[PDB]
């Protein structure tokens, strides 16, 4: 199917997913000097106190920490969102080297990796119904650079040997995603889509300005994962990011000056 190589990478996705050439695709480059501070923006509200993680999965594209979204336990509201968005899963995209990996860029700058905290609007009932709506999803993007170690990430780094190949999964309860958040909630926001197929244009993107630091060893463990499935030729899971897409008829708002 689709992947990230030279034969199935992003530049090929449009053949099986025409919306790849859509009018509100992600990711995009964030021109910090062209984004306009928006007063009407309300303060962001991250209520992850009752978050309940369940499993960690290698899907052959990335690895998802999945949560129990059967109740309003870890929600995202305020900011540009109208209503309540339930956290369903979070994933990363990283590069083969520290100077790449992120999907969004800031003034064309690429980060070592990008963390996506995915939530879906609770007025749609579930995630599968929510992805079919223009305001069905809210994704919290957080950049990752190499530097100091991010303690709240080590628990995820330690379990990755259990999900090395596509399809493998492992119990992963009691993970607190608040350890993955940066100090500040300053953000840019814009209307976009999922960054992998089906590339549905259903996402409100909230990208935090302040990155989180991770050690080179923490990301190195990311690079030891496998695209392939067990017993198959080893393709290392690296550079699983979509490059910046055309901004088109969109303006990026900022929550700060
Ligand atoms: C297919 C799917 O479930 C998914 C795809 C991309 C993202 B993202 O851009 O944050 C999240 C979820
Ligand atoms: Zn993603």
From Swiss-Prot:
Q: Where in the cell is it found?
A: Cytoplasm; Cell membrane
According to the record, mutating residue 194 to E/H/R results in: Strongly reduced CO(2) hydrase activity
Q: Which UniProt keywords apply?
A: Acetylation, Cell membrane, Cytoplasm, Disease variant, Lyase, Membrane, Metal-binding, Osteopetrosis, Phosphoprotein, Zinc
Where is substrate annotated to bind? 195-196
- What modulates its activity? Activated by X-ray, histamine, L-adrenaline, L- and D-phenylalanine, L- and D-histidine, L-His-OMe and beta-Ala-His (carnosine).
Q: Where does Zn(2+) bind?
A: 91, 93, 116
EC number, as in UniProt: 4.2.1.1, 4.2.1.69
Altering residue 194 to A: what's the impact?
Reduced CO(2) hydrase activity
**Noted pH dependence of activity:** Optimum pH is 6-8.
Question: Which chemical reaction does it catalyze?
Answer: hydrogencarbonate + H(+) = CO2 + H2O; urea = cyanamide + H2O
**UniProt effect for mutating residue 195 to S/V:** Reduced activity
Could you tell me one molecular function GO term of this UniProt entry?
Answer: zinc ion binding
The UniProt-reported impact of residue 114 to Q is: Strongly reduced activity and sulfonamide affinity
Q: List site positions: Involved in the binding of some activators, including histamine and L-histidine.
A: 89
Q: Does Cytoplasm show up as a keyword for this record?
A: yes
Gene3D superfamilies assigned? Alpha carbonic anhydrase (3.10.200.10)
The listed outcome for residue 62 to S is:
2-fold decrease in enzyme efficiency, as determined by kcat/KM ratio, and efficiently inhibited by chlorzolamide
What effect is documented for mutating residue 91 to Y? Answer: In OPTB3; partial loss of activity
Cite the cofactor comment: Zinc. Can also use cobalt(II) with lower efficiency, but not copper(II), nickel(II) and manganese(II).
* Source organism superkingdom: Eukaryota
Q: Which family does it belong to?
A: Belongs to the alpha-carbonic anhydrase family.
Q: What is this protein called?
A: Carbonic anhydrase 2
Q: Which organism encodes this protein?
A: Homo sapiens
This protein's gene is called CA2
């Amino acid at each position: 199917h689709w992947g990230y190589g030279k034969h199935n990478g992003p530049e090929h996705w449009h053949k099986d997913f025409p919306i790849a050439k859509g009018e509100r695709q992600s990711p995009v480059d964030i021109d910090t000097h062209t984004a306009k501070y928006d007063p009407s923006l309300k303060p962001l509200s991250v209520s992850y106190d009752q978050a309940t993680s369940l499993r960690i999965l290698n899907n052959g594209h990335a690895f998802n920490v999945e949560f129990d979204d059967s109740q309003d336990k870890a929600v995202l509201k305020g900011g540009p969102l109208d209503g309540t968005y339930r956290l369903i899963q979070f994933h990363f995209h990283w590069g083969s080297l520290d100077g790449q990996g992120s999907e969004h860029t800031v003034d064309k700058k690429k980060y070592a990796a990008e963390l996506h905290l995915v939530h879906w609007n609770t007025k749609y009932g579930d995630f599968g119904k929510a992805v079919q709506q223009p305001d069905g999803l809210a994704v919290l993007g957080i950049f990752l650079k190499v530097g100091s170690a991010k303690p709240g990430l080590q628990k995820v780094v330690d379990v990755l040997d259990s999900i090395k190949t596509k399809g493998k999964s492992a119990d992963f309860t009691n993970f607190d995603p608040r350890g993955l958040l940066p100090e500040s909630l300053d953000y840019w926001t814009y209307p976009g889509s999922l960054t992998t197929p089906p590339l549905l244009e259903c996402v409100t993107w909230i990208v935090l300005k302040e990155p989180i630091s991770v050690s080179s060893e923490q990301v190195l463990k990311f690079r030891k994962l496998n695209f392939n499935g067990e017993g198959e030729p080893e393709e290392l899971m690296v550079d699983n990011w979509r490059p910046a897409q055309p901004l088109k008829n969109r303006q990026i708002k900022a929550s700060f000056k």
